[PDB]
């Protein structure tokens, strides 16, 4: 597993430790997507929402997927590739989740759905990349997404993440 895989897992854990010491809301006020236009130049906020989790089990479940799928991208395609998927999906999954239902959300699962979509489509159109997603796991992923349509899931983060990963894998598959 590479530097970007590990750095992100450490970050999410450090931030979650702060959320236990200080309480959820205190961290949310400083890390959530800007709830007020005046705050709009607090640039960290467009990415920082990805680092917050509200359960130990929601953070165990996300770092697992992230280490599996993120580690695969870093190993096969490099650190720079994983940084870009991370940054774009975090920004765009946040943007869409905000419009669906406002700024009070968090979790890496937007980034995870982009990794699910990227690894799958890249492995299908471009097998020589040496990444792929089992059809079994694309099972999981699809049940998980539709289940949020009906636990208060950030539904716009999930679809926007997924879409982002598909588009990037599509573009990268042309080019490969």
């Amino acid at each position: 597993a590479g530097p970007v895989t590990w750095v992100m897992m450490i970050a999410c854990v450090v931030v979650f430790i702060a959320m236990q010491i200080l309480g959820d809301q205190e961290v949310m006020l400083w890390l959530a997507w800007p709830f007020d236009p005046t705050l709009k130049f607090e640039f960290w906020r467009y990415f920082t929402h990805a680092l917050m989790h509200f359960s130990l089990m929601h953070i165990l479940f996300n770092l697992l997927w992230w280490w599996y799928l993120g580690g695969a991208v870093e190993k096969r395609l490099g650190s720079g590739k994983l940084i870009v998927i991370t940054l774009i999906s975090a920004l765009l999954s946040g943007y869409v989740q905000q419009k669906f239902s406002g700024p009070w959300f968090g979790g890496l699962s937007g980034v995870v759905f982009a990794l699910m979509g990227y690894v799958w489509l890249r492995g299908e159109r471009d097998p020589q990349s040496g990444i792929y997603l089992q059809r079994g796991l694309i099972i999981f992923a699809l049940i998980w997404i539709v289940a949020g349509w009906f636990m208060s899931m950030a539904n716009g983060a999930h679809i926007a993440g997924l879409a982002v990963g598909l588009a990037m894998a599509f573009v990268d598959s042309l080019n490969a």
């Binding site: 959820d24 949310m28 929402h49 990805a50 989790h53 509200f54 359960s55 929601h58 999954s93 989740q97 239902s101 009070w104 959300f105 968090g106 979790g107 890496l108 699962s109 937007g110 636990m151 208060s152 899931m153 950030a154 539904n155 983060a157 999930h158 993440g161």
Partner: peptide
């Protein structure tokens, strides 16, 4: 509420 991504 808060939503979970």
């Amino acid at each position: 509420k808060v939503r979970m991504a």
